[PDB]
Design a binder for this molecule. Sequence first.
Ligand SMILES: [Os+4]
Length: 152
Amino acid sequence: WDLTVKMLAGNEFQVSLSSSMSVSELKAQITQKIGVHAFQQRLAVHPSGVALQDRVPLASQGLGPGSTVLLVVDKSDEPLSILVRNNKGRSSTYEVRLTQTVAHLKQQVSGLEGVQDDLFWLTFEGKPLEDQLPLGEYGLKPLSTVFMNLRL
Ligand SMILES: [Os+4]
């Protein structure tokens, strides 16, 4: 549908939802417009003033065509240290930013483990990480442990 995104810091712009129309799709539109990552987006329904449900559909959330949502962007991109456990079980500390991509992390890991980046993939809390997405998308925190998986 046609949705208005009002910023407390900016002005406002429209967006269109074309499919199941979920919270993710919305953020994908925001990113399309201002280039800010999804995980850096803070959204609330206007004027109810309540944050959105990442699981609940926009429809059954008091949002539809002509509705307004409030957006505040998180700028900060301070480095933090995370752990990556290798095949043998040994973990190593990496200094990263939540805005860097999984692919970038892999390159770092690869360079440190002397293993071609294409011979393994990474996982966190059982779910694999996608090369094109930013680390912040998986809720990594200090000393979080990401696992290396050999494509053997
Ligand atoms: Os404004």
